Structure formats: structure tokens, C-alpha cells
């Protein structure tokens, strides 16, 4: 019988700073034990300072990003070129996903940008459109490898203040863009070593009030 779903592998990572946000993804596209491409981007500038990735089944991912980019276009036409706030974009994507509740888009979605106070925002979705704002989120194949590391190194979980008998927690603070990109690069090199579907290349999209900048870094090709 025909199976309408597939797994194109890959893994994505969103981190929110004080006055910035990053959305990272590996550039490897796979089916089973074959490499389809070593450079196939799945992190996209959608306009209005919103970056988006739909990781999982690439066909469903491309379809959703295409539909959302179109949703941004028609929001401008229908509401006098008004800027689509990240919170509004998130709710719109919930409806796009829940629209196919009984034939889901098999993807994990993460959008990054700035909220209306200019502070870094990351939203993560399930396949059928349940969503939540988060400081930190990894998605896709190697999510299970990256996410606990980010709990430790971003949210300082299970870290206490030396000499306080584990009574005083290590204080939460915003990380610089330089410190965040280090954690992203290490997160992906670590995932590349232990996950066969992750490697080839890492593409990071950084969102500030100035706009959307790109950085590329080579990963192991085995």
C-alpha cells in the first residue's frame, strides 16, 4: 500500500537572546541510508524579521513554509502593509497546521524573531499545531541529543553556586550572540558525531532589529 509520508532527517535549533534570536539547521537531506544533498537549506527568511524551519518530511516542510510566506504576503495586502508580529505569525501557523489535523504535515516547526518589545522570541509547534513560546528549542532527528545540553548551558539547569551546599541556584542571565553561536556550533558538531542523519553543513540565521544575517560552518561529511 502507498505510504504518503517520508523522513528526510536533519535537525534544527532556535535560541532567543535579549535583543536577538538565532534559528540554526544542518544542510544535509537524507532518505534511509542515502544522502540526497549535502547543501539543501531548510531555514528561511519569511519577511517581517521572521525566520522559519519545518523539519521532518521535506515535502510537508516546503509546503508549510510556502503557505506561511504566502500568508505574510496576503496579510500586507489585507491590512495596509502592517508588520506581522511574531506572536501573530505563531497563531497563524497553528491554524495552518490544525487545518490538516486528520492528514497532518509531518514536521516540527520553529520560528524565531523579535517580539513587539524588541526582545528575542522563539516559538515551537507539534505537527498538528500546538505551540508555546520558549527561550530554547531543538527539533528533528538529533533533538534528544541537543535539548538536554541547552537545558544545562542556556537555562543553567542542575547547576548550583559553588560552596552554597546546593541551596543557591546559578543565576539566569541573557547570553551574547557570540556565546549563543558557540553553543549552536558545539551542539551540531556533537550531534554530527553521534547521529548519522546530521552533518555536511550548518546554516545559522541571526535576527536583530537591523535585519536577518547568515553564517555558514562546515560539518563532518561521513
Amino acid at each position: 500500500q502507498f505510504n504518503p509520508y517520508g523522513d528526510n532527517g536533519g535537525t534544527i535549533l532556535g535560541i532567543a537572546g535579549e535583543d536577538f534570536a538565532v534559528l540554526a539547521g544542518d544542510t544535509r537531506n537524507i532518505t534511509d541510508y542515502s544522502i540526497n544533498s549535502r547543501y539543501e537549506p531548510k531555514v528561511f527568511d519569511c519577511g517581517d524579521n521572521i525566520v522559519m524551519s519545518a523539519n521532518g518530511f521535506a515535502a510537508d516542510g516546503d509546503a508549510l513554509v510556502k503557505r506561511f510566506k504566502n500568508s505574510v504576503k496576503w496579510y500586507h495586502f489585507d491590512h495596509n502593509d502592517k508588520k506581522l508580529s511574531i506572536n501573530s505569525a505563531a497563531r497563524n501557523i497553528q491554524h495552518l497546521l490544525y487545518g490538516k489535523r486528520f492528514f497532518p504535515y509531518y514536521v516540527h516547526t520553529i520560528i524565531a524573531g523579535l517580539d513587539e518589545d524588541g526582545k528575542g522570541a522563539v516559538y515551537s509547534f507539534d505537527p498538528v499545531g500546538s505551540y508555546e513560546r520558549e527561550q530554547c528549542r531543538a527539533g528533528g532527528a538529533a533533538a534528544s541529543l541537543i535539548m538536554p545540553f541547552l537545558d544545562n548551558q542556556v537555562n543553567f539547569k542542575n547547576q548550583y553556586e559553588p560552596g552554597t551546599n546546593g541551596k543557591v541556584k546559578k543565576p539566569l542571565k541573557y547570553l551574547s550572540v557570540e556565546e549563543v553561536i558557540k553553543l549552536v556550533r558545539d551542539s551540531f558538531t556533537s550531534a554530527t558525531e553521534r547521529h548519522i542523519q546530521v552533518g555536511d553543513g550548518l546554516e545559522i540565521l541571526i535576527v536583530t532589529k537591523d535585519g536577518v544575517r547568515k553564517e555558514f560552518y562546515e560539518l563532518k561529511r561521513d
Partner: protein
């Protein structure tokens, strides 16, 4: 694990914040209470998307009622909008366990349990989710109608903590709400990590864990 119970001081609503995909812990920071309107609360159990989407939709339907009838909707009417909606979808695979909690002058404090099978139940006490049995154990044992507001809030908080401990698919933090004639009041987010040890030390309970 979600619960809501009626008492002298109104309604207590307490929920956990954990989401799981199989044995993978997807989130520890989920908001399982939908605010809806200042006198109406919804709890979420089962499918995250099903609950979040349809209870947000319920908030829209409740707003339209109030624009059209120039009156706030009753908890009975609000609960039946949601129960009638899920009944249309019955057999399609919607997964929802839910409690509609609110005060209105004509009804008083009211709790309605609504699930995706189409069950709609009015009751004083309800616990819904994988950890409901753990919550019920603590709630039923210490529940009195004439509980104080401070004691009722603690019992709700304590009953979630009990379930968070024993249930693998419950945990993260406890979100506390108190519903009166004036409306609902948020009583904060309590991380189970810090709460557990505080409760153990102060209550002298949880003797089963290393001490």
C-alpha cells in the same frame, strides 16, 4: 495531572506543566490553563493541539455570545458549546480531557468535566489526566467543604506535587488559580524541583525518598 474542586471560598484549579512524546519529555513549561475570560477557566489534558486549539476557539465563541446577548455566558452554556463541538468530531480521534471552571451570579461557582467521547459532567471535585489517581488520593483524603482559601490553595498544589512525583507523564511546575465572584486570581508557578524539597522539609512527608 489537572484538578479543580469547589469549596466555601469558591473554586481551586491546579495543573502541572509537562508534555511527553512517548518517553521523551517534550516540555516542562506548558500552560495547561486557558484564561478564556476573567470569570472562566479551561484545563487541558490529552492531545496538546486538540485542547489548545479548541479551548482558544471556545474563548472566541464565548466573546461572540457576550457581544450578541450583552451578558457574560454561563459556565453551563460555555461547557455545552465545547461538548457539542467534540461530539460532532466523535470517532475522528480527538483526545481531550477538560474542566470548564467559572463563577456567575445565577449559577454560583461551577465546574464542568468535558471529554472527546462527548461526556459532560457537573461536579464539586474532578481530577483529569494520567496522574488523576495520585491527585484523587491526596484530595479525597484531606478534602473538606469548609477548607480555608490558604489551605485549599495548598491542597490543590500538594495534590499536583503528589501526582508529579509518582506519574512519569506529570511534572515540571504547578500552576495555581483561585476563582471567586470577583473573578479568577493567579497564585503563581511553583517549580516541582524546589517545591518538592520545601514540602518534604516543612510537612515531614515523602519519607520514601533518600533522607
Amino acid at each position: 495531572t489537572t484538578l479543580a474542586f469547589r469549596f466555601q471560598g469558591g473554586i481551586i484549579v491546579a495543573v502541572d506543566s509537562r508534555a511527553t512524546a512517548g518517553n521523551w519529555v517534550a516540555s516542562q513549561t506548558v500552560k495547561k490553563v486557558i484564561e478564556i475570560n476573567p470569570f472562566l477557566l479551561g484545563t487541558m489534558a490529552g492531545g496538546a493541539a486538540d485542547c489548545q486549539f479548541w479551548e482558544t476557539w471556545l474563548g472566541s465563541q464565548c466573546r461572540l455570545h457576550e457581544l450578541r446577548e450583552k451578558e457574560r455566558i454561563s459556565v453551563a452554556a460555555a461547557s455545552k458549546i465545547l461538548s457539542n463541538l467534540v461530539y460532532q468530531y466523535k470517532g475522528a480521534g480527538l483526545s481531550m480531557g477538560t474542566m470548564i471552571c467559572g463563577y456567575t451570579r445565577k449559577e454560583g461557582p461551577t465546574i464542568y468535566y468535558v471529554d472527546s467521547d462527548g461526556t459532560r459532567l457537573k461536579g464539586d471535585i474532578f481530577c483529569v489526566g494520567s496522574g488523576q489517581t495520585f491527585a484523587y488520593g491526596v484530595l479525597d483524603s484531606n478534602y473538606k467543604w469548609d477548607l480555608s482559601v490558604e489551605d485549599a490553595l495548598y491542597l490543590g498544589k500538594r495534590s499536583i506535587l503528589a501526582a508529579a512525583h509518582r506519574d512519569a507523564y506529570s511534572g515540571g511546575s504547578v500552576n495555581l488559580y483561585h476563582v471567586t465572584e470577583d473573578g479568577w486570581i493567579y497564585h503563581g508557578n511553583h517549580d516541582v524541583g524546589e517545591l518538592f524539597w520545601k514540602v518534604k522539609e516543612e510537612e515531614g512527608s515523602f519519607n520514601n525518598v533518600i533522607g
